[PDB]
Amino acid sequence: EDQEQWAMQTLMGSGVLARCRIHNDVILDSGNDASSAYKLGTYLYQKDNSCNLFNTLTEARDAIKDAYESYCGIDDCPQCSKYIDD
């Protein structure tokens, strides 16, 4: 398992993104307030780490920005569209 993926749990679970009940390891783009997601991400990731260049929030933003941009272009899991929905 991946840690960064664990973050997505709550971060993304904040309702920012969309996930399939059959796919908990999948990320779908919703187009909701990402700002909130980012905050939620930093919140879970670690308390207020607001410090000098030392700590860079860009990492987190890139984490979600990466995952988001990674799955970006998908508003619905193709699996369900590639399979039958019991």
Ligand SMILES: [Zn+2]
């Ligand atoms: Zn699905």
